[PDB]
Amino acid sequence: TTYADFIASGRTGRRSAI
Amino acid sequence: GHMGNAAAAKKGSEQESVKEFLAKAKEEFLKKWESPSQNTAQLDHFDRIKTLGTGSFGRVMLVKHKETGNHYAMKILDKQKVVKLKQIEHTLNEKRILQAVNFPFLVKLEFSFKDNSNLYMVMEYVPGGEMFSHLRRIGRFSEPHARFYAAQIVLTFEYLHSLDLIYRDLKPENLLIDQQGYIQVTDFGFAKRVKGRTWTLCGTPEYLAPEIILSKGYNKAVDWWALGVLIYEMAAGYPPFFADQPIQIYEKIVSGKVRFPSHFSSDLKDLLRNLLQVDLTKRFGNLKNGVNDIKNHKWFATTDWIAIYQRKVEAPFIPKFKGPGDTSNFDDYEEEEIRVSINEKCGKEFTEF
Ligand SMILES: O=S(=O)(NCCNCc1ccccc1)c1cccc2cnccc12
């Protein structure tokens, strides 16, 4: 699922600016 | 047409009243911008309670003002780290913005001061924590729930843009929930006064507009792109563009392609396709009718904009609050000391603070 793909991205936690 | 006479007359007058409000708000902002406040308290006026967040050049602590017993969020910035990390202009600018704006969804700066080591910004404490945590915890917000929050960002951006301020760092991590369930925007490190265009590469990968990625001069339309990303993430539970590595996120952003969960209403998809529009001549918020293309969109047809502004709408969700000073909605951090040097550090760099 797209949800599974999101989990697999590793970017489910808090994101900092570039 | 789409509106009968009465509704059209009402909408036209509403839109004229917004212009009138913004003109007065811009006058009040510029007065405070040109003549800012400085040194309105001192460190020993507060008790330190708990660290609410940490960064590479400072932290935010829950504090209690001794005289009044009020709780505040105190941002402590280490002057030496600010300089080493090249954040001088951003830090002074954030303070200058915060002391000059006034809007029900922008955090209120109640005190600021400095000492030999650190800079201090004392803000209202927003006890509900970040939208980010509630969103990950619930999974996703239903469309009415997301719309309630989106409506507040629309009005907040309409305000900021009328002041020529581009926000540039919208994301659920930057949106706090107050005790009535409404949003507070607290961080202005990347905001800039931009009447025309600007060029800095800044933001968070998932929320970057394509024209930032492509190294173009850009304008306030990047904030409306970021609103499309926010609405999507709130309603889906995940953002529209994600991948293992940022470069792959950026290829998705610029491709002009976006996919939607099957539970998204058609009205929501139509709004998102118009906010997540790679072509600037077609992006909502960037056209001749300005913010009105967004506010009059079908997905917001049930939104009473004045009622949202007046905070008269019942929030979908009120965070758990066991009392003043409750910190259960914030992450836990190790409590490090606040050392203040015998010698003034970086006095010239922070003269205007
Ligand atoms: O420490 S914060 O949560 N930080 C803001 C939200 N998190 C920002 C962020 C940090 C790191 C990565 C991404 C976002 C904060 C700041 C300012 C005023 C506050 C008022 N009441 C509570 C907390 C406040």
PDB file of all heavy atoms in Angstrom, chain B residues 318-338, unseen atoms left out:
ATOM      1  N   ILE B 318      -9.916  18.693  21.251  1.00  0.00           N
ATOM      2  CA  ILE B 318      -9.319  19.497  22.310  1.00  0.00           C
ATOM      3  C   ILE B 318      -8.261  18.630  22.978  1.00  0.00           C
ATOM      4  O   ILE B 318      -8.595  17.573  23.512  1.00  0.00           O
ATOM      5  CB  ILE B 318     -10.344  19.951  23.360  1.00  0.00           C
ATOM      6  CG1 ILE B 318     -11.484  20.728  22.700  1.00  0.00           C
ATOM      7  CG2 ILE B 318      -9.654  20.753  24.459  1.00  0.00           C
ATOM      8  CD1 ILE B 318     -11.067  21.971  22.049  1.00  0.00           C
ATOM      9  N   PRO B 319      -6.994  19.028  23.010  1.00  0.00           N
ATOM     10  CA  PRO B 319      -5.985  18.142  23.591  1.00  0.00           C
ATOM     11  C   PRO B 319      -6.205  17.947  25.076  1.00  0.00           C
ATOM     12  O   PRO B 319      -6.747  18.815  25.766  1.00  0.00           O
ATOM     13  CB  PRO B 319      -4.665  18.862  23.316  1.00  0.00           C
ATOM     14  CG  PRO B 319      -4.962  19.790  22.184  1.00  0.00           C
ATOM     15  CD  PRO B 319      -6.388  20.219  22.402  1.00  0.00           C
ATOM     16  N   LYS B 320      -5.788  16.772  25.554  1.00  0.00           N
ATOM     17  CA  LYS B 320      -5.780  16.488  26.981  1.00  0.00           C
ATOM     18  C   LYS B 320      -4.995  17.567  27.713  1.00  0.00           C
ATOM     19  O   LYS B 320      -3.861  17.890  27.348  1.00  0.00           O
ATOM     20  CB  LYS B 320      -5.168  15.101  27.236  1.00  0.00           C
ATOM     21  N   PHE B 321      -5.621  18.174  28.712  1.00  0.00           N
ATOM     22  CA  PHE B 321      -4.944  19.181  29.525  1.00  0.00           C
ATOM     23  C   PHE B 321      -5.381  18.966  30.969  1.00  0.00           C
ATOM     24  O   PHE B 321      -6.558  19.150  31.289  1.00  0.00           O
ATOM     25  CB  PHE B 321      -5.259  20.600  29.032  1.00  0.00           C
ATOM     26  N   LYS B 322      -4.447  18.523  31.823  1.00  0.00           N
ATOM     27  CA  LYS B 322      -4.729  18.247  33.229  1.00  0.00           C
ATOM     28  C   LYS B 322      -4.574  19.477  34.121  1.00  0.00           C
ATOM     29  O   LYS B 322      -4.816  19.380  35.328  1.00  0.00           O
ATOM     30  CB  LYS B 322      -3.816  17.127  33.746  1.00  0.00           C
ATOM     31  N   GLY B 323      -4.195  20.625  33.561  1.00  0.00           N
ATOM     32  CA  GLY B 323      -4.011  21.838  34.325  1.00  0.00           C
ATOM     33  C   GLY B 323      -2.958  22.727  33.693  1.00  0.00           C
ATOM     34  O   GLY B 323      -2.246  22.313  32.776  1.00  0.00           O
ATOM     35  N   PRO B 324      -2.829  23.966  34.161  1.00  0.00           N
ATOM     36  CA  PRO B 324      -1.704  24.786  33.703  1.00  0.00           C
ATOM     37  C   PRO B 324      -0.394  24.067  33.976  1.00  0.00           C
ATOM     38  O   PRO B 324      -0.261  23.302  34.937  1.00  0.00           O
ATOM     39  CB  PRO B 324      -1.831  26.075  34.523  1.00  0.00           C
ATOM     40  CG  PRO B 324      -2.676  25.711  35.688  1.00  0.00           C
ATOM     41  CD  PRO B 324      -3.613  24.643  35.207  1.00  0.00           C
ATOM     42  N   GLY B 325       0.572  24.295  33.100  1.00  0.00           N
ATOM     43  CA  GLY B 325       1.842  23.614  33.227  1.00  0.00           C
ATOM     44  C   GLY B 325       1.855  22.156  32.799  1.00  0.00           C
ATOM     45  O   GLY B 325       2.921  21.537  32.830  1.00  0.00           O
ATOM     46  N   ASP B 326       0.715  21.589  32.412  1.00  0.00           N
ATOM     47  CA  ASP B 326       0.693  20.237  31.856  1.00  0.00           C
ATOM     48  C   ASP B 326       1.594  20.177  30.623  1.00  0.00           C
ATOM     49  O   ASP B 326       1.480  21.021  29.731  1.00  0.00           O
ATOM     50  CB  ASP B 326      -0.752  19.858  31.500  1.00  0.00           C
ATOM     51  CG  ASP B 326      -0.905  18.420  31.023  1.00  0.00           C
ATOM     52  OD1 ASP B 326      -0.022  17.921  30.299  1.00  0.00           O
ATOM     53  OD2 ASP B 326      -1.936  17.800  31.355  1.00  0.00           O
ATOM     54  N   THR B 327       2.503  19.187  30.589  1.00  0.00           N
ATOM     55  CA  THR B 327       3.448  18.980  29.489  1.00  0.00           C
ATOM     56  C   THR B 327       3.307  17.602  28.842  1.00  0.00           C
ATOM     57  O   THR B 327       4.197  17.175  28.096  1.00  0.00           O
ATOM     58  CB  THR B 327       4.890  19.140  29.960  1.00  0.00           C
ATOM     59  OG1 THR B 327       5.186  18.103  30.897  1.00  0.00           O
ATOM     60  CG2 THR B 327       5.124  20.478  30.598  1.00  0.00           C
ATOM     61  N   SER B 328       2.208  16.898  29.106  1.00  0.00           N
ATOM     62  CA  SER B 328       2.067  15.534  28.612  1.00  0.00           C
ATOM     63  C   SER B 328       2.050  15.464  27.081  1.00  0.00           C
ATOM     64  O   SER B 328       2.313  14.397  26.518  1.00  0.00           O
ATOM     65  CB  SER B 328       0.796  14.904  29.200  1.00  0.00           C
ATOM     66  OG  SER B 328      -0.378  15.623  28.844  1.00  0.00           O
ATOM     67  N   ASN B 329       1.794  16.571  26.389  1.00  0.00           N
ATOM     68  CA  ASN B 329       1.744  16.542  24.929  1.00  0.00           C
ATOM     69  C   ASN B 329       3.094  16.812  24.283  1.00  0.00           C
ATOM     70  O   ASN B 329       3.160  16.915  23.062  1.00  0.00           O
ATOM     71  CB  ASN B 329       0.694  17.539  24.418  1.00  0.00           C
ATOM     72  CG  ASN B 329      -0.710  17.121  24.809  1.00  0.00           C
ATOM     73  OD1 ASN B 329      -1.140  16.035  24.483  1.00  0.00           O
ATOM     74  ND2 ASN B 329      -1.403  17.961  25.537  1.00  0.00           N
ATOM     75  N   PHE B 330       4.167  16.922  25.068  1.00  0.00           N
ATOM     76  CA  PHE B 330       5.502  17.171  24.541  1.00  0.00           C
ATOM     77  C   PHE B 330       6.423  16.001  24.855  1.00  0.00           C
ATOM     78  O   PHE B 330       6.240  15.292  25.848  1.00  0.00           O
ATOM     79  CB  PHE B 330       6.087  18.487  25.112  1.00  0.00           C
ATOM     80  CG  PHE B 330       5.378  19.702  24.595  1.00  0.00           C
ATOM     81  CD1 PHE B 330       4.248  20.177  25.228  1.00  0.00           C
ATOM     82  CD2 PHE B 330       5.782  20.309  23.435  1.00  0.00           C
ATOM     83  CE1 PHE B 330       3.558  21.282  24.735  1.00  0.00           C
ATOM     84  CE2 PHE B 330       5.114  21.412  22.946  1.00  0.00           C
ATOM     85  CZ  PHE B 330       3.990  21.904  23.611  1.00  0.00           C
ATOM     86  N   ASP B 331       7.401  15.799  23.979  1.00  0.00           N
ATOM     87  CA  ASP B 331       8.419  14.785  24.177  1.00  0.00           C
ATOM     88  C   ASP B 331       9.245  15.118  25.401  1.00  0.00           C
ATOM     89  O   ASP B 331       9.316  16.268  25.843  1.00  0.00           O
ATOM     90  CB  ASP B 331       9.370  14.682  22.976  1.00  0.00           C
ATOM     91  CG  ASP B 331       8.685  14.231  21.703  1.00  0.00           C
ATOM     92  OD1 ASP B 331       7.762  13.394  21.784  1.00  0.00           O
ATOM     93  OD2 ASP B 331       9.082  14.721  20.615  1.00  0.00           O
ATOM     94  N   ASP B 332       9.906  14.096  25.923  1.00  0.00           N
ATOM     95  CA  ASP B 332      10.741  14.220  27.109  1.00  0.00           C
ATOM     96  C   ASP B 332      12.194  14.335  26.677  1.00  0.00           C
ATOM     97  O   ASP B 332      12.614  13.677  25.725  1.00  0.00           O
ATOM     98  CB  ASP B 332      10.546  13.014  28.024  1.00  0.00           C
ATOM     99  CG  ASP B 332       9.125  12.887  28.516  1.00  0.00           C
ATOM    100  OD1 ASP B 332       8.631  13.870  29.111  1.00  0.00           O
ATOM    101  OD2 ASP B 332       8.502  11.812  28.311  1.00  0.00           O
ATOM    102  N   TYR B 333      12.954  15.189  27.364  1.00  0.00           N
ATOM    103  CA  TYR B 333      14.338  15.468  27.008  1.00  0.00           C
ATOM    104  C   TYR B 333      15.151  15.523  28.283  1.00  0.00           C
ATOM    105  O   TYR B 333      14.613  15.783  29.361  1.00  0.00           O
ATOM    106  CB  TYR B 333      14.500  16.798  26.252  1.00  0.00           C
ATOM    107  CG  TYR B 333      13.768  16.894  24.942  1.00  0.00           C
ATOM    108  CD1 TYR B 333      12.433  17.271  24.898  1.00  0.00           C
ATOM    109  CD2 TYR B 333      14.412  16.624  23.738  1.00  0.00           C
ATOM    110  CE1 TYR B 333      11.751  17.370  23.693  1.00  0.00           C
ATOM    111  CE2 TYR B 333      13.731  16.723  22.517  1.00  0.00           C
ATOM    112  CZ  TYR B 333      12.402  17.091  22.507  1.00  0.00           C
ATOM    113  OH  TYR B 333      11.719  17.196  21.318  1.00  0.00           O
ATOM    114  N   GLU B 334      16.456  15.269  28.159  1.00  0.00           N
ATOM    115  CA  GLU B 334      17.343  15.381  29.313  1.00  0.00           C
ATOM    116  C   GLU B 334      17.522  16.849  29.651  1.00  0.00           C
ATOM    117  O   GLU B 334      17.661  17.693  28.761  1.00  0.00           O
ATOM    118  CB  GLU B 334      18.704  14.730  29.035  1.00  0.00           C
ATOM    119  N   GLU B 335      17.497  17.160  30.942  1.00  0.00           N
ATOM    120  CA  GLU B 335      17.554  18.551  31.391  1.00  0.00           C
ATOM    121  C   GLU B 335      19.016  18.959  31.537  1.00  0.00           C
ATOM    122  O   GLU B 335      19.697  18.534  32.469  1.00  0.00           O
ATOM    123  CB  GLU B 335      16.780  18.718  32.693  1.00  0.00           C
ATOM    124  CG  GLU B 335      15.298  18.385  32.571  1.00  0.00           C
ATOM    125  CD  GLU B 335      14.585  19.305  31.592  1.00  0.00           C
ATOM    126  OE1 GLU B 335      15.104  20.419  31.359  1.00  0.00           O
ATOM    127  OE2 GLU B 335      13.543  18.904  31.030  1.00  0.00           O
ATOM    128  N   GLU B 336      19.503  19.770  30.601  1.00  0.00           N
ATOM    129  CA  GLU B 336      20.851  20.320  30.660  1.00  0.00           C
ATOM    130  C   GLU B 336      20.825  21.693  31.337  1.00  0.00           C
ATOM    131  O   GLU B 336      19.791  22.362  31.394  1.00  0.00           O
ATOM    132  CB  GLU B 336      21.452  20.413  29.249  1.00  0.00           C
ATOM    133  N   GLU B 337      21.976  22.108  31.870  1.00  0.00           N
ATOM    134  CA  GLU B 337      22.039  23.355  32.633  1.00  0.00           C
ATOM    135  C   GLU B 337      22.016  24.574  31.713  1.00  0.00           C
ATOM    136  O   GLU B 337      22.333  24.505  30.522  1.00  0.00           O
ATOM    137  CB  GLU B 337      23.298  23.389  33.509  1.00  0.00           C
ATOM    138  N   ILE B 338      21.613  25.714  32.281  1.00  0.00           N
ATOM    139  CA  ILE B 338      21.682  26.995  31.571  1.00  0.00           C
ATOM    140  C   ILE B 338      22.856  27.781  32.141  1.00  0.00           C
ATOM    141  O   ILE B 338      22.689  28.575  33.070  1.00  0.00           O
ATOM    142  CB  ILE B 338      20.372  27.796  31.673  1.00  0.00           C
TER     143      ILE B 338
END
